[PDB]
Design a protein around this ligand. Structure first.
Ligand SMILES: CCCCCCCCCCCCCCCCCC(=O)OC[C@H](COP(=O)(O)OCCN)OC(=O)CCCCCCCCCCCCCCCCC
Ligand SMILES: CCCCCCCCCCCCCCCCCC(=O)OC[C@H](COP(=O)(O)OCCN)OC(=O)CCCCCCCCCCCCCCCCC
Ligand SMILES: CCCCCCCCCCCCCCCCCC(=O)OC[C@H](COP(=O)(O)OCCN)OC(=O)CCCCCCCCCCCCCCCCC
Ligand SMILES: CCCCCCCCCCCCCCCCCC(=O)OC[C@H](COP(=O)(O)OCCN)OC(=O)CCCCCCCCCCCCCCCCC
Ligand SMILES: CCCCCCCCCCCCCCCCCC(=O)OC[C@H](COP(=O)(O)OCCN)OC(=O)CCCCCCCCCCCCCCCCC
Ligand SMILES: CCCCCCCCCCCCCCCCCC(=O)OC[C@H](COP(=O)(O)OCCN)OC(=O)CCCCCCCCCCCCCCCCC
Ligand SMILES: CCCCCCCCCCCCCCCCCC(=O)OC[C@H](COP(=O)(O)OCCN)OC(=O)CCCCCCCCCCCCCCCCC
Ligand SMILES: CCCCCCCCCCCCCCCCCC(=O)OC[C@H](COP(=O)(O)OCCN)OC(=O)CCCCCCCCCCCCCCCCC
Ligand SMILES: CCCCCCCCCCCC(=O)OC[C@H](COP(=O)(O)OCC[N+](C)(C)C)OC(=O)CCCCCCCCCCC
Ligand SMILES: CCCCCCCCCCCC(=O)OC[C@H](COP(=O)(O)OCC[N+](C)(C)C)OC(=O)CCCCCCCCCCC
Ligand SMILES: CCCCCCCCCCCC(=O)OC[C@H](COP(=O)(O)OCC[N+](C)(C)C)OC(=O)CCCCCCCCCCC
Lengths: 64, 90, 158, 506, 205, 491
């Protein structure tokens, strides 16, 4: 009833609720929001590919 | 009737022959079960010698007991996968 | 055997008691559940609910199937494990061992005498038992040489 | 045939008077046009002849056996979609009259089908830009066909703005390539595949990724699919993906010639993020179309892994997956349109407002479907289990074939992540099934005369009145049994996908 | 004698001894740290302009609040990314190559350093729990071969003859170990003893 | 002949029950005639179908040769090769015998929808039975996971108060873990171009690749036995699932994991299985010891039995990973013996007590022997079978499994003997309480075991004791099939 729930249903439910609540705030009809994300993605073309894992770490920081 | 073991070794066949590899696998299995049959017969002799000899069993059954203790480690089923997948000489 | 005239008697009598919750000569057949008119099927249930309403753990409808289909099936399974002419590998190997003893010792007067008189039913009963049989020479010959051919299949050494 | 018959329908629709019956009969003429288009296309295009790849119209177009299969798939799915507007989906006028109130509905579909079928064939940068505009403009006009609807117009505004930004990105990529090489034909550009900047083609793919709703550009498609009418959302969420993904496969086929692993890593980054968003995004949602929008984002990520690997095993994976996913998409939306007839009627907390465009808008409006219609509820369960990937349904072989191509190319991470993504998304797929069936016994003996279906009259009380119309019922029956019983013909179907070649030859 | 444990690791090209010129860890971390701080700080002052241009429009304000970064995040993010780049290169130089253990250590420490800056108002054990989770993800990323196995994939092996295109033959026995993606019919018994060791049925009983 | 008839006949049975019971849905509002007596006729047809499935495997058993090496009855159907050996034959018969028992256990304790339940039971039985006769990895996975669709709906519709929790647990624990097993199957099909049993058994893969493939498969197997620490789904699923669902889950579904080791690990990944055996033994030993001590503190009757099943299946895992015939035969006999005793204990605990009092809390029951003497006899008899008392098939399975572990690993395999003590600690703590002291003050005196519940208990007890006294009925069939799994090169 302890660690196997934290690393199981109860723990993953809290993780899912936290992550899904973040994603629910990103779906709203707004021109400025989607334009910023489109233009931001252009940096993947500019950046050298070795920086992908740093962008991955930065994105996980923003989830918090 | 009484079927017989098709004596066929892994060393004399091409494994790409499906029926030939099947025979070598069966051939190795049947020779191990016979050794199990022989071991049980030897153990039958040991039990009868022990019962009859009474206090003389140490001397009377000495060579039967010695043979059973030698055959016991290897007169058991070992499978065919071990020798099929391994070449001892390499 | 729907017998619609019989239901009308059954339906009417339950009407003689307006109060609720305060026959053995009835049966149905297999062809009735699919061919009766929609009106008659309604009547049968209206009685069955009310007949049951006017009421231990028997006649539940499974006894015939399990005691005609299932128990004979287990009996047949019991028969197969008992009286099926199937050799196992261990039983085959003992027969093969006795056969090779005969072939290696054809010139043996004593051994072949015991092998011929050793019946097929006592092949697995070799040793000390209630059966009075002579296998002393048979056991003697197995203890002497090795009648397996495992060394002939491993042609590669270290 | 499409172009010629479209002109006649355009003029004919403006000549006759406006009535719901006439618009419905004009829609049936559109059904005949697509059927004749399919028959003519089948009569002349064959897989064996198109294996080499045949140029048409001064090499502006290039059709091969890989392009041809997608064109026939587009025509077949478009046939199934037109049955929705050409026949009764529910049989009740308050719901069905919407599909007959716009006479230009069928005209826009025929406009878009032309754009859908020509896009995979593009062989020049000038015609690539022209066709991608033709497909996009028709999608905007279809998203705004119901111009008296506030949400429908708002979606079309969002669709236009985002899709114009992507088109500019696509145009900017082709202009950069023309600036580098001074050439416009794709086969001419292939001669200089080693000298042009390959990331100029990644910019071209980025504009295509926006138009398929890939992450991080997923936000607008999730918003648009939920706000649009269910009949509109059924089309726009599937049709653009059939053509654009096929075009992405052909572009990635040319990109793999130079083997730029940096480009492979950026795309893998977009696939990885889309799996995370597609699975975790749908966990906390209450709208069914919002849930299906994330399902679409997730299944696109699965296909893009096959497109990214881009090998012989990828042709079989992509071709089979796109066919079976289209049928599952069609089957689910057909059931959702039908089952609005089982909605309870008032005679209140949360002040829930339901409109005529989307009568089924929340997942919990599917409650007690196991009681109202067991056969339809099972049909919906089979489709949802296929999306989950329960064998031996079609959805299992789709994931199995995608994994084979992905793992054969060394995409260990993406193969593991998608299988984790499949498990996470199973949570919200199961929630549909929980709503359909789990309260069956505690509700079986209840009196429900307050349904939408109960408002319909009865003819004679001596006849048998079917509760669902003939055509829509047969389509749901056919697609559900295909999804269920694909094991019977799976071996023969996958042998056909072996023959579909994209310059393999030998 | 060493324990004979299974080794579930995907194939990777192994640099020969004397190879692997190391990468300058400070220089590489400097580019990530400076470039990130310039962008994050620059995008911060760009968004303040968008604030001043409009603050009576709720639609713009809602979208700007999502992308807004706190002051401790504008400093913590470049520091965490810079420490990650430094520690990833520093450990890679130590081990003559990149390993999943090195990336697990580099990511968790970089996360914990950043978390202790922009997540000050949370318990210390909470920050460590996230750092262990973040470090495991990047260790798993390296274990799976980053985004693709590349030259170690089966498709690459099949093109180099190291696959199983020609099939198998038991008469052929190879002293050297088979390739990662290669399967054989029969193996030298010495290889089995090297893998499993003697004992419970190998050679002896 | 076997697979083709077993599938075609059951499809006709499924369609027949649907046609009869759904012909009157169309606003007839009638009273029908098959709906009487809780759909008695529709229940009886499904009960007959289950028994006929047992007759089909028998016709192919009469021709089975116990002295033939290899798969028999080799058949092609739906582009899939189907075959049977000694190991598969016994597991198929065990699976089909439990079919009628699952239906009869829920003969009159469902709130409704009897046709749906009977179809799902017959559908679960055939899919599990077909899983023992497939001959390739992909066909193994298709049948391994196909049972999730009906099982998920069976729990959620016919389950207890926490059925929603249990339905999600079984769907997500098993599907997520099996997808890792699918990854290993995809790798086999990529590098060898086939998933056939015989084809892949002859190929030796690199010791590093064998490790990755073993871990992928073992993840799917370890969750479904289940083993620690991925066992937490089972107690929740067993306490909420219907009685027939618990019988099939505790009788067949868990045995597919042992058969997974026999097919997917031992003959194809032989070299890496020897490397992993100490890890397997440590995990299984701690699974056995931990589950036994945890079972002591449980307060739910159906959860106590669920944890008892985990302890014995750890012993089955230990035996099957012994590299000798004694352990392999012992693990297989213990699988069959458990396949009868464990469903019987669920009938006593969750089928007789629950159908009378509708409460599974331990604190309500004591002194049952005063007014339920027949229940106490069967409860006591099956309790001693469950702890491996001699004369029961459980002991023969347990003793050979423990002996096989000792022969395989004398030091750590000796810890397996704690099954003898620990199993009796929690099982006889529960039985000593149900049959001890004064009849409970929280219970009203009611009927004892009925004829149907006597029938179920007798025909689960009878096979356990026949196997316990004369296991050679089973060992003769398994002898040649089990000997092929041993890997060793003695010089
Ligand atoms: C109308 C349905 C007609 C089916 C025709 C399918 C088709 O296009 O032909 C098979 C096609 C290969 O065709 P090909 O070899 O290139 O040309 C000569 C073949 N005669 O192979 C293909 O590429 C077809 C690809 C798309 C296949 C879609 C399968 C659709 C399944 C049936 C639809 C459901 C039917 C529902 C019924 C509702 C109507 C009442
Ligand atoms: C033997 C069984 C084995 C099976 C088990 C396998 C699962 C093991 C994983 C266990 C980890 C999850 C369980 C614990 C998570 C608990 C989440 C949580 O409590 O929220 C923490 C915090 C929000 O704070 P709050 O919850 O409100 O209060 C603090 C309570 N002390 O918010 C947080 O800090 C959460 C962290 C932010 C999210 C980080 C996201 C990282 C990337 C996602 C992780 C999964 C990646 C999957 C990738 C593929 C997805 C398609
Ligand atoms: C007179 C001055 C003129 C200044 C012009 C630049 C304007 C200010 C912008 C700040 C600088 C960032 C952009 C720098 C150029 C783009 C990156 C690049 O190309 O690499 C250059 C730099 C040095 O790398 P170098 O090895 O010298 O280049 C290859 C040589 N063979 O590589 C780097 O290390 C750059 C640092 C990048 C790492 C930080 C970015 C990642 C973290 C922030 C993420 C931003 C948001 C995420 C966007 C993606 C969203 C999906
Ligand atoms: C320079 C500007 C900032 C950079 C933005 C980058 C945008 C494109 C990157 C791809 C992510 C697309 C998702 C939509 C973009 C998110 C827009 C955004 O930045 O808003 C921040 C959002 C809101 O969070 P909140 O803290 O509540 O708001 C701030 C309050 N002041 O917080 C979020 O929820 C953002 C996280 C969204 C989920 C993305 C997760 C993608 C998967 C990452 C893990 C990958 C899984 C595999 C891991 C194993 C490998 C290590
Ligand atoms: C948050 C911190 C929690 C633990 C972080 C990781 C610790 C586990 C670990 O592996 O530590 C090792 C780490 C450096 O990792 P490594 O690449 O192995 O060092 C070179 C060896 N020749 O050494 C460390 O500095 C830590
Ligand atoms: C009326 C005449 C019936 C049609 C006769 C026919 O030829 O059907 C084809 C097949 C018969 O088998 P045949 O092709 O001769 O050779 C065996 C290979 N299947 O018969 C069949 O293919 C019948 C297949 C339909 C029944 C199986 C449907 C799937 C069942 C669920 C999958 C179970 C396994 C997972
Ligand atoms: C309910 C309880 C039920 C039972 C629970 C389990 C109890 C059994 C647990 C112990 C396992 C059985 C012990 C058998 C080991 C004794 C075998 C032996 O003969 O000892 C010596 C043997 C090697 O023989 P030797 O010739 O003397 O060594 C020199 C070789 N040139 O090997 C040796 O050298 C000694 C090997 C080390 C023995 C360690 C014993 C401690 C185990 C503790 C387990 C954790 C507590
Ligand atoms: C509560 C549930 C109700 C059920 C409870 C009681 C269960 C039934 C008890 C019996 C269990 C079934 C096992 C017996 C079935 C017959 C087994 C058999 O086939 O015996 C064959 C035996 C040797 O075989 P063979 O030499 O090859 O000759 C026959 C060729 N067909 O040939 C023979 O010599 C046959 C000898 C049979 C002897 C009678 C066996 C009955 C049991 C008595 C002995 C039990 C063992 C002693 C235990 C005492 C306590 C320690
Ligand atoms: C890989 C090694 C083998 C592991 C096999 C898979 C086990 C997954 C964990 C069980 C989850 C479960 O069962 O999901 C069911 C649970 C039910 O939660 P509940 O009890 O109703 O509490 C929740 C409600 N409360 C707290 C209010 C009472 O939904 C969840 O929590 C939703 C989160 C879903 C996450 C699923 C991701 C799966 C990833 C698998 C690989 C890491
Ligand atoms: C469970 C499996 C773990 C393998 C052990 C391992 O990979 O060990 C942990 C590794 C160590 O790898 P290393 O130290 O870089 O290499 C070792 C030294 N070498 C270079 C000599 C080989 O690190 C990690 O934390 C990686 C996280 C691995 C997560 C895997 C998830 C499960 C996927 C299932 C695949 C079917
Ligand atoms: C071996 C392969 C077989 C494949 C065919 C499956 C059965 C098809 C049933 C369609 C007809 C139907 O929906 O009918 C409904 C029937 C019977 O319900 P009822 O109690 O009469 O309904 C109530 C009517 N009253 C109110 C008049 C009494 O439910 C079934 O049959 C259920 C079986 C399917 C459950 C599991 C679904 C899993 C989906 C994914 C599978 C991999």
């Amino acid at each position: 009833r302890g660690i196997l729930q934290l690393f199981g249903p109860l723990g993953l439910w809290k993780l899912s609720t936290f992550i899904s609540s973040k994603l629910n705030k990103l779906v709203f009809l707004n021109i400025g929001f989607i334009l910023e994300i489109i233009v931001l993605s252009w940096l993947l073309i500019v950046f050298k590919v070795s920086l992908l894992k740093y962008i991955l770490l930065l994105i996980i920081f923003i989830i918090l | 009737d009484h079927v017989r073991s098709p004596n066929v070794s892994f060393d004399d066949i091409d494994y790409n022959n499906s029926q030939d590899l099947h025979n070598a696998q069966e051939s190795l299995l049947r020779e191990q079960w016979i050794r199990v049959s022989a071991l049980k017969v030897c153990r039958k002799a040991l039990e009868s010698c022990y019962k009859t000899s009474g206090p003389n069993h140490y001397e009377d059954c000495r060579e039967i007991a010695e043979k059973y203790l030698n055959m016991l480690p290897d007169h058991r089923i070992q499978g065919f996968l071990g020798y099929q997948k391994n070449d001892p000489s390499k | 055997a729907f017998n619609l005239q019989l239901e009308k008697e059954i339906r009417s009598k339950i009407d003689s008691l307006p109060k609720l919750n305060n026959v053995t000569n009835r049966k149905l057949s297999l062809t009735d559940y699919l061919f009766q008119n929609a009106a008659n099927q309604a009547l049968y249930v209206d009685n069955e609910a009310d007949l049951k309403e006017l009421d231990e753990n028997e006649n539940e409808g499974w006894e015939k199937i399990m005691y005609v289909g299932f128990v004979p099936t287990m009996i047949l399974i019991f028969a197969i494990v008992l009286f099926k002419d199937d050799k196992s590998i261990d039983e085959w190997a003992m027969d093969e061992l006795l056969l090779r003893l005969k072939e290696k010792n054809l010139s043996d007067v004593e051994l072949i005498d015991e092998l011929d008189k050793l019946s097929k039913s006592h092949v697995g009963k070799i040793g000390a038992s209630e059966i009075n049989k002579r296998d002393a020479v048979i056991i003697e010959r197995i203890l002497n040489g090795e009648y397996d051919q495992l060394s002939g299949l491993k042609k590669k050494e270290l | 045939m499409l172009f010629t018959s479209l002109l006649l329908i355009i003029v004919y629709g403006s000549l006759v008077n406006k009535s719901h019956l006439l618009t419905k009969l004009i829609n049936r003429l559109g059904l005949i046009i697509i059927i004749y288009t399919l028959l003519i296309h089948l009569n002349i295009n064959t897989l064996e002849n198109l294996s080499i790849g045949i140029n048409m119209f001064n090499n502006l177009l290039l059709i091969n056996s890989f392009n041809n299969t997608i064109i026939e798939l587009i025509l077949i799915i478009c046939i199934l979609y037109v049955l929705l507007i050409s026949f009764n989906i529910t049989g009740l006028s308050i719901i069905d009259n919407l599909n007959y109130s716009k006479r230009t509905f069928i005209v826009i579909v025929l406009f878009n089908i032309i754009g859908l079928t020509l896009l995979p064939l593009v062989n020049d940068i000038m015609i690539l830009f022209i066709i991608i505009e033709l497909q996009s403009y028709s999608l905007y006009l279809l998203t705004a066909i119901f111009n008296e609807s506030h949400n429908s117009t708002k979606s079309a505004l969002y669709y236009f703005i985002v899709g114009s930004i992507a088109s500019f990105i696509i145009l900017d990529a082709t202009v950069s390539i023309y600036d580098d090489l001074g050439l416009t034909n794709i086969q001419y550009i292939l001669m200089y595949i080693d000298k042009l900047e390959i990331f100029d083609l990644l910019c071209l793919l980025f504009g295509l990724f926006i138009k398929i709703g890939l992450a991080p550009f997923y936000s607008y498609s999730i918003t648009i699919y939920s706000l649009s009418p269910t009949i509109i959302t059924n089309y726009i969420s599937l049709m653009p993906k059939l053509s654009i993904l096929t075009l992405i496969y052909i572009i990635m086929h040319y990109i793999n010639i130079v083997n730029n692993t940096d480009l492979n890593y950026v795309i893998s980054f977009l696939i990885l993020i889309s799996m995370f968003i597609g699975s975790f995004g749908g966990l906390n949602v209450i709208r069914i179309k919002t849930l299906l929008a994330y399902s679409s984002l997730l299944n696109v990520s699965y296909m893009l892994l096959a497109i990214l690997s881009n090998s012989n095993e990828s042709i079989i994976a992509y071709i089979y997956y796109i066919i079976q996913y289209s049928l599952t998409h069609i089957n689910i939306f057909s059931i959702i349109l039908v089952i609005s007839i089982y909605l309870p009627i008032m005679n209140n907390m949360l002040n829930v407002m339901i409109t005529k465009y989307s009568p089924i808008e929340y997942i919990n409006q599917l409650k007690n479907l196991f009681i109202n219609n067991i056969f339809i509820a099972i049909a919906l369960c089979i489709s949802i289990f296929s999306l989950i990937g329960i064998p031996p349904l079609t959805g299992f072989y789709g994931k199995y074939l995608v994994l084979i191509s992905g793992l054969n190319n060394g995409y260990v991470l993406l193969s593991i992540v998608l299988i984790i993504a499949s498990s996470i998304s199973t949570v919200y797929y199961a929630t549909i099934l929980k709503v359909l069936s789990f309260d069956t016994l505690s509700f079986k003996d209840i009196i429900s005369n307050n349904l939408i279906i109960n408002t319909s009259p009865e003819n004679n009380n001596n006849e048998i009145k079917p509760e669902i119309s003939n055509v829509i019922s047969y389509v749901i029956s056919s697609l559900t049994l295909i999804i269920l019983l694909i094991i019977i013909q799976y071996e023969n179907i996958v042998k056909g996908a072996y023959l579909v070649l994209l310059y393999n030859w030998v | 004698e060493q324990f004979h444990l299974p080794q579930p690791f995907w194939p990777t090209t192994k640099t020969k001894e004397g190879e692997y010129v190391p990468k300058d860890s400070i220089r590489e971390a400097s580019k990530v740290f400076i470039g990130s701080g310039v962008l994050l700080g620059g995008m911060h002052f760009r968004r303040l302009m968008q604030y001043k241009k409009g603050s009576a429009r709720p639609g713009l304000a809602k979208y700007l609040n999502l992308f807004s970064l706190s002051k401790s995040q504008l400093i913590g993010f470049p520091v965490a990314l810079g420490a990650f780049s430094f520690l990833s290169h520093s450990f890679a130089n130590l081990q003559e190559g990149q390993t999943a253990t090195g990336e697990f250590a580099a990511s968790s420490i970089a996360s914990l350093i950043g978390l202790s800056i922009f997540r000050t108002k949370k318990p210390l054990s909470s920050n460590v729990a996230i750092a262990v989770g973040m470090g495991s993800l990047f260790g798993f990323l390296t274990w799976a071969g980053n985004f693709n196995l590349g030259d170690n994939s089966y498709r690459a092996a099949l093109e180099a003859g190291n696959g199983n295109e020609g099939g198998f033959d038991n008469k052929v026995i190879k002293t050297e170990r088979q390739g990662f993606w290669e399967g054989v019919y029969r193996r030298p018994l010495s290889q089995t003893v090297e893998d499993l060791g003697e004992g419970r049925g190998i050679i002896t009983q | 002949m076997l697979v083709q008839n077993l599938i075609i006949f059951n499809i006709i049975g499924i369609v027949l029950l649907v046609l009869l019971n759904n012909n009157n849905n169309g606003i007839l509002n009638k009273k029908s005639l098959l709906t009487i007596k809780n759909e008695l006729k529709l229940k009886q047809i499904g009960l007959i179908i289950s028994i006929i499935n047992i007759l089909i495997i028998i016709e192919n058993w009469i021709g089975f040769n116990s002295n033939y090496y290899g798969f028999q009855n080799i058949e092609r159907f739906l582009n899939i090769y189907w075959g049977i050996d000694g190991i598969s034959l016994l597991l198929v018969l065990l699976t089909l015998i439990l079919g009628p028992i699952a239906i009869l256990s829920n003969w009159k304790n469902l709130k409704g929808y009897y046709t749906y339940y009977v179809i799902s039971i017959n559908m679960l039985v055939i899919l599990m039975a077909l899983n023992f006769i497939c001959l390739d990895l992909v066909s193994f996975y298709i049948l391994f996971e196909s049972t999730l669709a009906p099982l998920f709906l069976l729990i959620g519709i016919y389950g207890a108060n926490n059925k929603n929790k249990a339905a999600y647990y079984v769907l997500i624990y098993t599907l997520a873990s099996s997808l890792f097993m699918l990854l290993s199957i995809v790798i086999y099909y990529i590098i060898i171009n086939s998933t056939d049993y015989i084809y892949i058994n002859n190929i030796i893969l690199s010791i590093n690749l064998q490790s990755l493939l073993f871990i992928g498969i073992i993840i799917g197997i370890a969750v479904k036995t289940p083993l620690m620490p991925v066992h937490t789904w089972l107690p929740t699923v067993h306490s909420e699932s219907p009685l027939g669902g618990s019988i099939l889950l505790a009788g067949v579904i868990l045995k597919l994991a042992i058969y997974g080791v026999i097919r997917l690990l031992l003959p194809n990944l032989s070299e890496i299985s020897m490397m992993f055996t100490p890890i397997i033994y440590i995990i299984s030993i701690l699974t056995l010891i931990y589950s036994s001590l945890i079972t002591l503190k449980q307060t739910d009757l159906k959860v106590i039995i669920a944890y008892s099943s985990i302890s014995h299946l750890a012993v089955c895992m230990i035996g099957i990973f012994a590299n000798n015939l004694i352990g392999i035969n012992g693990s297989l006999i213990l699988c069959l013996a458990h396949g009868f005793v464990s469903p019987a204990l669920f009938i006593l605990v969750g089928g007789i007590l629950y159908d009378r009092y509708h409460n599974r809390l331990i604190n309500y029951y004591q002194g049952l022997s005063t007014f339920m003497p027949i229940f106490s006899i069967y409860l006591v008899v099956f309790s001693f079978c469950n702890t491996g008392t001699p004369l029961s098939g459980n002991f023969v399975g347990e003793f050979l499994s423990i002996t096989g572990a000792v022969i395989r690993h004398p030091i750590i395999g000796s810890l397996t003997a704690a099954s003898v003590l620990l199993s009796a600690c929690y099982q006889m703590k529960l039985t000593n309480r149900l049959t001890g002291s004064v009849f409970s003050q929280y219970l009203h005196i009611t009927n004892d075991v009925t004829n149907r519940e006597i029938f179920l208990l007798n025909w689960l007890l009878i096979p356990t004791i026949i196997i316990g006294i004369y296991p050679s009925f089973v060992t003769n069939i398994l002898n040649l099939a089990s000997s092929t799994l041993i890997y060793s090169v003695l010089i």
